[PDB]
Design an enzyme around this catalytic site. Structure first.
Site, mmCIF file in Angstrom:
data_model
loop_
_atom_site.group_PDB
_atom_site.id
_atom_site.type_symbol
_atom_site.label_atom_id
_atom_site.label_comp_id
_atom_site.label_asym_id
_atom_site.label_seq_id
_atom_site.Cartn_x
_atom_site.Cartn_y
_atom_site.Cartn_z
ATOM 1 N N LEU A 18 -32.131 -20.937 -15.471
ATOM 2 C CA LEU A 18 -32.325 -19.571 -15.005
ATOM 3 C C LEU A 18 -31.910 -19.436 -13.541
ATOM 4 C CD1 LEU A 18 -35.784 -18.792 -16.659
ATOM 5 C CD2 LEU A 18 -33.486 -18.181 -17.458
ATOM 6 N N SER A 20 -29.376 -21.967 -10.352
ATOM 7 C CA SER A 20 -28.896 -23.209 -9.771
ATOM 8 C C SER A 20 -28.552 -22.951 -8.305
ATOM 9 C CB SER A 20 -27.706 -23.750 -10.540
ATOM 10 O OG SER A 20 -27.206 -24.959 -9.975
ATOM 11 N N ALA A 24 -31.998 -26.713 -5.420
ATOM 12 C CA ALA A 24 -32.937 -26.474 -6.505
ATOM 13 C C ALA A 24 -32.237 -26.026 -7.785
ATOM 14 C CB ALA A 24 -33.964 -25.442 -6.085
ATOM 15 N N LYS A 41 -39.093 -24.662 -11.139
ATOM 16 C CA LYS A 41 -38.130 -24.830 -10.061
ATOM 17 C C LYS A 41 -38.205 -26.269 -9.561
ATOM 18 C CE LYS A 41 -36.892 -22.813 -5.491
ATOM 19 N NZ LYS A 41 -37.307 -21.843 -4.465
ATOM 20 N N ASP A 138 -35.832 -14.001 3.458
ATOM 21 C CA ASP A 138 -34.669 -14.210 2.608
ATOM 22 C C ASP A 138 -34.573 -13.063 1.604
ATOM 23 O OD1 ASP A 138 -32.369 -15.599 1.738
ATOM 24 O OD2 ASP A 138 -33.468 -16.990 0.428
ATOM 25 N N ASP A 160 -38.479 -16.482 -4.464
ATOM 26 C CA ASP A 160 -37.882 -17.429 -3.537
ATOM 27 C C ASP A 160 -38.514 -17.346 -2.146
ATOM 28 O OD1 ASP A 160 -36.360 -19.255 -2.117
ATOM 29 O OD2 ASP A 160 -34.427 -18.236 -2.481
HETATM 30 C C1 LIG Z 1 -31.965 -16.499 -9.473
HETATM 31 N N1 LIG Z 1 -32.669 -17.368 -8.546
HETATM 32 C C2 LIG Z 1 -32.030 -17.646 -7.269
HETATM 33 C C3 LIG Z 1 -33.916 -17.846 -8.816
HETATM 34 C C4 LIG Z 1 -34.673 -17.414 -9.945
HETATM 35 C C5 LIG Z 1 -35.934 -17.911 -10.123
HETATM 36 C C6 LIG Z 1 -36.738 -17.440 -11.265
HETATM 37 C C7 LIG Z 1 -36.114 -17.087 -12.451
HETATM 38 C C8 LIG Z 1 -36.852 -16.601 -13.509
HETATM 39 N N2 LIG Z 1 -38.182 -16.449 -13.443
HETATM 40 C C9 LIG Z 1 -38.787 -16.771 -12.294
HETATM 41 C C10 LIG Z 1 -38.105 -17.252 -11.183
HETATM 42 C C11 LIG Z 1 -36.377 -18.809 -9.140
HETATM 43 CL CL1 LIG Z 1 -37.940 -19.529 -9.296
HETATM 44 N N3 LIG Z 1 -35.668 -19.213 -8.112
HETATM 45 N N4 LIG Z 1 -34.421 -18.724 -7.939
#
Ligand SMILES: CN(C)c1cc(-c2ccncc2)c(Cl)nn1
Length: 276
Positions: A18, A20, A24, A41, A138, A160
């Site tokens: 979900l 990259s 992370a 994450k 951010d 984030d």
């Molecule tokens: C798209 N990016 C940068 C993302 C998405 C998520 C995330 C995706 C789906 N549900 C919860 C969080 C996180 Cl944790 N961190 N970065």
């Protein structure tokens, strides 16, 4: 602080990616004991004291501390934290409607009502954070996620907290710097930072929501940063000819170089374009 060191695969099954990023990777997961779904994450840890790759333990601990404190409809919630020698694993609330960024690309640009529908929720989320003296640092469309993208008025959550910091003394002076297109002049100039930086970001997001165009975007990162520091933006008639003067007023009061003269979160919520 130490986190749960049991193998995360013992308590959860993972699925599709979900997200990259540089340090992370995010994967959908399902807790075995409840059947509930989350976003895991995986954050890569630094391998040596002075390594440039990976995130310092100090940075991971700060992020976790902030996440453990928040609970609000417009912010992501932290479920649990695991760790092993290579990563820290944040089990976060699943937000499955995709990024505000992808939704925006699907529509080109939004009407003022659609834009204020999203903006009000962003403002409410940021009002909560600022009330807690938390600067996000951010804010951008990629860090806004919809719970369901196929409804007329989607619910959003801010994600984030990788750069978020407590601002106990009104300002912080640290190695903080996000995406050039959305960072405030004080970030570009390496000046002390406070909650006001987030308000600039909101101004940038609002401009994008209404036009489909980025206000300070240059051909290179350095040019973008230079544009930001000079407050080099304008409302192109081609994109804003039918935008209300009040919407432009809102943006103008956020895209102010001097942080002391920029609207605060409370002021933004009382602004005539927002206040119902
Ligand atoms: C798209 N990016 C940068 C993302 C998405 C998520 C995330 C995706 C789906 N549900 C919860 C969080 C996180 Cl944790 N961190 N970065």
């Amino acid at each position: 602080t130490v986190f749960r060191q049991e193998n995360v695969d013992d308590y959860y099954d993972t699925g599709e990616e979900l997200g990259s990023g540089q340090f992370a990777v995010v994967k959908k997961c399902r807790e075995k004991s409840t059947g509930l779904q989350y976003a895991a994450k995986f954050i890569k840890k630094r391998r040596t004291k002075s390594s440039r790759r990976g995130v310092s333990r100090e940075d991971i601990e700060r992020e976790v501390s902030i996440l453990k404190e928040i609970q609000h409809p417009n912010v992501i919630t932290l479920h649990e934290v695991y760790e092993n020698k290579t990563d820290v694993i944040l089990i976060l609330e699943l937000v499955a409607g995709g990024e505000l960024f992808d939704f925006l690309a699907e529509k080109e640009s939004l009407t003022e009502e659609e834009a204020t529908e999203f903006l009000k929720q962003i403002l409410n989320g940021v009002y909560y954070l600022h009330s807690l003296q938390i600067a996000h640092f951010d804010l951008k469309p990629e860090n806004i996620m919809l719970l369901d993208r196929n409804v007329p008025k989607p619910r959003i959550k801010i994600i984030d907290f990788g750069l978020a910091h407590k601002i106990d003394f009104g300002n912080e002076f640290k190695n903080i710097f996000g995406t050039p297109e959305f960072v405030a002049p004080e970030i570009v100039n390496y000046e002390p930072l406070g909650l006001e930086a987030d308000m600039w970001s909101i101004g940038v997001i609002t401009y994008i929501l209404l036009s489909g165009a980025s206000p300070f975007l240059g051909d290179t990162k350095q040019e973008t940063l230079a544009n930001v520091s000079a407050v080099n933006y304008e409302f192109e008639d081609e994109y804003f000819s039918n935008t209300s003067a009040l919407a432009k007023d809102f943006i103008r009061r956020l895209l102010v170089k001097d942080p002391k003269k920029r609207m605060t979160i409370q002021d933004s919520l009382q602004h005539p374009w927002i206040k119902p």
